[PDB]
């Protein structure tokens, strides 16, 4: 239960920052 | 079942909605072409909230695109999720707002507003039980302010029992991208007061502030700045799109965060926000989400909340997580900070917890803060408007388009007339 | 001979101040905040040699 | 249809190229086409 | 869709038009033949697409005297311009506002208006007009004034930008230029929606100090003016982050209708073998525009009051850096704004870096054009007022005007309203006390 | 559970605390990356006294690392156990203290104390039962003096029942790496007296006395000195990691004013004499109580031992039986009286103080600081002669 | 980040800057093209040039210096010779007429043709600079431009830039050799007009470097280059702890606060150690005690004033190379026990120790390769002798008014001499109560 109560951010969270030039 | 019609007006609103739709399309599972390819079943349970059905098992946004210049329509179409919107919903005019509230509220905006109301009726009647409307715009500048407020007034007249949420970008003290931003904001706030139910004031200075210290991005760009607001929007409208425990929809948020009707100018927030190089040094759990969420450097409006008492607080958590821990943490923050919460509204934090997190995470939190500290924004814009209306400069455009000198005084007096209750509640 | 260019002792690029990003090459969408200055390798060696003065 | 595909391909390629140009922080803050500057110096000396 | 019509009047107008249109042709890709080799839409603001891939400019070249049009009709761009666009008279205006406005203007006004009407008919949405002239010669004063008088009554709702060469405070080239300038600023005050003015001595200083040209000429001056006007009308040519229109240019400069005389400056005017040594970063290019030596008139903004500013950024530029440069500007006490315009900046950004004509300016991926409305222009007004007062004290050269046909009181009345325009400038620039 | 928030002021405090985190990470089994790589399960039993948990079993020090110059904290990150701290705990100033007390107490330091109090509160909230704070600073110079004592004042105002352990590096008799260290020390001992609960005076001359006359080193370094300081710190705080802080303060501070302590650590042997050592309890006591292993340069034979502690040691890694001394004696009179004459000599001719009066201070501040520092003295002369 | 801006005034300042920027280029890795070799730049991350050199595009490393002279040809060797591509030509600022050894022509008449452009270029240099550590003004107390334009620069920079530090590196006139005759006039005028604007002014004498190059360098025919590079090494050592990292770093603010007792006294003595001459340098081991004894020996002082005719107030020692900090503590113990070195009776802890790890770099020339060095700045009362000698010289000139018509015709009034002399006499009086022992 601890292994999913912990929150480890994955690449799908850092791949949404810096995606457009505007 | 419930529905929210998405409306986006102006350059800022269109590019913010061009993002809100990409983020929620990756949340639900819709490809750029429009049909669904995902991983789990419950993504299509409540997909008829923001998406209307189409043929071949594809889904289109229930969005209305409003602008008075055909320059951002092409950017929205050429964007990533551009070939998903209804081309009939791409309503636009071949003219120029020119950053004038007058040319959005009393001139060609008032000519295009009938064709806008046409598709607004179309998408709001292709329903069975509507919940409301969600308009994204910027108070500083034309189109989004003027046409946005005219659209708000007509829609609120037509459908009064449904909610009107407005995600609005307000001018910031630090940097201004338009010299008539005080005029536009002051003329738009008066229409925003006695029409809408939930305004979300967002400062670009605060967004860049988060991007420089919280996100630690090297090049914070406009797509990123709209993406934080998109994450806040998707966090707010979550309990009505995915199942959860103690679900709170937008109407329950309205009734628990608007104590008296005019005081509804919220401060949005979003707090699983960590930099990549500091990702492994963090411990994202319930205290960390509430901790960064009540931290007064993640507020997307530049209204500092330790200079004013919180009236009401909403926390919509995402991801499945310990209800007792959430309740204990919300008791703990109220017990620790007793001077920043008003005494006549006891236990003034509302809690929602949805089971399904946003993508890239396991746990998340979205903040809605109705506080006394919103008075700084209106005092600041009032100071700018008095300084630049004292000489009544930048005003022959408004008198030529058809405004009157009494209307500016009425808008200024109404902004001060909202500055009065927000300090009476702060001083009991 | 005239000189040996010693790279051991000089102040490298500041990981904490002057964070405009125009000091590290390539596309870097996050600020460099993992401690690995370009003088780490040529200094961690000296550290290995350093001794602790309790029971050496 | 084909002309719309050509236009959308042009916008996509321009967007990707501008991504790779303005997400490069050093070259964005200070930079220029040094080869073009050399050619311009040679042209100025020739004239 | 977003077309605008160019009207070049006089020798200065024609040669600035030559520089402007070669810059436009190199910007988009239209050959001197008039045919794009590549084979978009950006060739609507300046060009018109006639069949078999032919691109005709949206310009009218007017001069009452030949050979300055015949140089164009003989040279490399003879197949580009439609021959009915280029309009000539048969008599030189002879540095005479009377000749340009009262007798030899009426043989050409009907033809010029017919051509302009055909151009406006070949337009869906007309953004405005760009009238390029000078405050010198009889053509560029009188015929420009008469053109604005006819355009104001026939096209009243459209926008107008004047691009005029104001006389030098010191050097100039003629003995009648103060008279013509006093006569024409009073007729183009009420008929120009926004009027940018450039000064030959200031462009001389810019070319001699920044471009390392010890002997600059009119080709270099008009190419700099071409770069300035192309940086102005760029957001309605290509796509960008903050696209700002011609009505926004008109808006965020003027606080009052009579104050529509901003000053334009350009950034990177650097000279190739100086760009190896500076960063040309956004903060630097914003500082160089506010520096009181890159100004395109010989006035000191330190002896004045900045009303408003529009910054027009072209190239690889980020609004973060734009906001940082604005914040760096707003702390200096030398650049002292007025107290009734706190937010005194408007920003515009387009993704297209300036093209390079083979010549003087250097290839840069960052540029900004500054359009600054300020009270420092009263000095440049009042020096020509002093010259006009000295000559009109005992009525030099007045017999030419009054024998050509224009009444005597025009001089005194134009001088009076110029003094009124001054008094308006200090009345606006003075601070609030009540 | 009980925990300690470790704040460190200045260049000197930053390097001392960097070596402290190195020796504590070696003591508990934390690699420079941060992952626990140890051999005994008792090391993770009470690890939550200095290390906060993170995702994936990453233990991060509960440390706030302050310096008004933006160059020392880069060196702390570039150090060996530099990739262990939080990056947002590295709060800094884009200026320089410049060896000035007012430039840490009434200026930029007082502009940055808000952010440091934010970070210290940020760490103290995410905890259960905080026993005390732990500030390492240099008594001389700037930052550690001005900003450090302002930090102590604000932390005492906010948290009133938490023990302040301030390891202060006092000026030396023999040597002086600055010139305004009497001014800084005399202006900061005043704030140390009525704020802190346990002041540990550590002097570099006494440290070199230990490192040369007993350790037989040939080229002793600053890392060597800070290692001795950090070993003393770990011996002080080992009781709640494997007589705690409250017990030591209660049993060792008789009267509330006098609490300046002589530290020491004495399983100490040179490499040339380690193989002939016969480590026992009487040997540890003899190596302890003798006045050659003192860490503050004031001779205990000159005074009377008021109170004495002895933390005997899970031993530190690589050793068999260790012994940490903390003692309050009347010999600490010498440390204050040696610098009181320096301060009155540099103040009688009214020099070096224009760059204290220009920052927002007055003339009477120095005189009142000297007066109450002299009034510190009569409680440490009366008990030396009953 | 920790940048400093250099301004080199006059012919003296310009050739000083030539030597200094040659040493900066050779130490910091930058070629005389500006481009750094790829091996020298450690992964493109060696920020230890940011205090002197500013990165532009194309890898160029343009210096943060302004070479100002009122008269040509001296800037012209710089922009024609081997370093012509390093400096931006707009950094180099040149007039067309000399001051002709007139403070009046350097400050009042020909100063206005260049003061606006030099201040504009200093604004430009400070623009791309986030934290300005200070200005370094290198000039002489001799020539007319080096007095007058220096004074006007101090006035303008103090009005515009009141919160930033200013260190002068000035060439004091010598007791015996001299280069001109109006030299006492220029020195006395510019000391008064830069006293209240200079934050700290280090002075360097010519005959002392004459003696040092003849004695410790074994070379009997050096020139101004061999004299001049020692000043280059001293500036490289004073701003060294904010270029490289060491055991005990030290900032420009720290030099002031540990060197300047009273606001008027800001005239330290610069001394340098190992000035040894290659075939004199392998024979001694040159420990920290030896290099401290070299600085405190009253023959390696670089102003011709003998420190035993005075008392030290504050000494800032700056060591570079393989220097052990408690070895230098043991060395300064012996220096304090030595009796010929006498301190004032009110500053017992009169030392500030700064340690930098980076060894001194060797240019192709006269100095030796050594792994230990020290620059010692002593603020002492012995410089009242060098003051009073020029006081005597000015008295002998001004008794009957030689060369005064030149100074009064070019804008300056008569009473400027009188007020400068009164301020100098007040400063000389101030030294007496500073030096005298406390009796209360
Ligand atoms: N850039 C540029 N400026 C010019 C040119 N010709 C003249 N000017 C400036 O314009 C001022 C007057 O020139 P014009 O008004 O064009 O003279 P004109 O139109 O031929 O008038 P007429 O001789 O009567 O026909 C002069 O003071 C010049 O400074 C030119 O060819 N290029
Ligand atoms: N490092 C160094 N110092 C110098 C050099 N040349 C001169 N000095 C000092 O400068 C003093 C006088 O020369 P300047 O002050 O430069 O004369 P100036 O600046 O040309 O003044 P004007 O002749 O009026 O233009 C001499 O006494 C020298 O001690 C030099 O080449 N290098
Ligand atoms: N968050 C966000 N803000 C934007 C974006 N684009 C523009 N803005 C803001 O919107 C403001 C001006 O927009 P506005 O004048 O209202 O556009 P208009 O409605 O078409 O006239 C500027 O100050 C920008 O900061 C965007 O993509 N995202
Ligand atoms: N034990 C120890 N003492 C140090 C260290 N670094 C500096 N010091 C002492 O700190 C004193 C000067 O430091 P200081 O000027 O106060 O640094 P600041 O606090 O940043 O101003 C010197 O006398 C040193 O003896 C260290 O790493 N360990």
TrEMBL record, chain A:
<comment type="subunit">
    <text>Microtubule inner protein component of sperm flagellar doublet microtubules.</text>
</comment>
<protein>
    <submittedName>
        <fullName>RIB43A domain with coiled-coils 2</fullName>
    </submittedName>
</protein>
<comment type="similarity">
    <text>Belongs to the RIB43A family.</text>
</comment>
From TrEMBL, chain C:
<protein>
    <submittedName>
        <fullName>Cilia and flagella associated protein 95</fullName>
    </submittedName>
</protein>
Automatic annotation (TrEMBL), chain E:
<keyword id="KW-0206">Cytoskeleton</keyword>
<keyword id="KW-0378">Hydrolase</keyword>
<comment type="subunit">
    <text>Dimer of alpha and beta chains. A typical microtubule is a hollow water-filled tube with an outer diameter of 25 nm and an inner diameter of 15 nM. Alpha-beta heterodimers associate head-to-tail to form protofilaments running lengthwise along the microtubule wall with the beta-tubulin subunit facing the microtubule plus end conferring a structural polarity. Microtubules usually have 13 protofilaments but different protofilament numbers can be found in some organisms and specialized cells.</text>
</comment>
<dbReference type="InterPro" id="IPR003008">
    <property type="entry name" value="Tubulin_FtsZ_GTPase"/>
</dbReference>
<dbReference type="InterPro" id="IPR036525">
    <property type="entry name" value="Tubulin/FtsZ_GTPase_sf"/>
</dbReference>
<dbReference type="GO" id="GO:0005525">
    <property type="term" value="F:GTP binding"/>
</dbReference>
<dbReference type="GO" id="GO:0000278">
    <property type="term" value="P:mitotic cell cycle"/>
</dbReference>
<dbReference type="Pfam" id="PF00091">
    <property type="entry name" value="Tubulin"/>
</dbReference>
<keyword id="KW-1017">Isopeptide bond</keyword>
<dbReference type="InterPro" id="IPR023123">
    <property type="entry name" value="Tubulin_C"/>
</dbReference>
<keyword id="KW-0342">GTP-binding</keyword>
<dbReference type="InterPro" id="IPR017975">
    <property type="entry name" value="Tubulin_CS"/>
</dbReference>
TrEMBL record, chain F:
<keyword id="KW-0963">Cytoplasm</keyword>
<dbReference type="Pfam" id="PF03953">
    <property type="entry name" value="Tubulin_C"/>
</dbReference>
<protein>
    <recommendedName>
        <fullName>Tubulin beta chain</fullName>
    </recommendedName>
</protein>
<keyword id="KW-0493">Microtubule</keyword>
<dbReference type="InterPro" id="IPR002453">
    <property type="entry name" value="Beta_tubulin"/>
</dbReference>
<dbReference type="InterPro" id="IPR000217">
    <property type="entry name" value="Tubulin"/>
</dbReference>
<dbReference type="InterPro" id="IPR013838">
    <property type="entry name" value="Beta-tubulin_BS"/>
</dbReference>
<dbReference type="GO" id="GO:0046872">
    <property type="term" value="F:metal ion binding"/>
</dbReference>
<comment type="subunit">
    <text>Dimer of alpha and beta chains. A typical microtubule is a hollow water-filled tube with an outer diameter of 25 nm and an inner diameter of 15 nM. Alpha-beta heterodimers associate head-to-tail to form protofilaments running lengthwise along the microtubule wall with the beta-tubulin subunit facing the microtubule plus end conferring a structural polarity. Microtubules usually have 13 protofilaments but different protofilament numbers can be found in some organisms and specialized cells.</text>
</comment>
<keyword id="KW-0479">Metal-binding</keyword>
<dbReference type="GO" id="GO:0007017">
    <property type="term" value="P:microtubule-based process"/>
</dbReference>
<keyword id="KW-0832">Ubl conjugation</keyword>
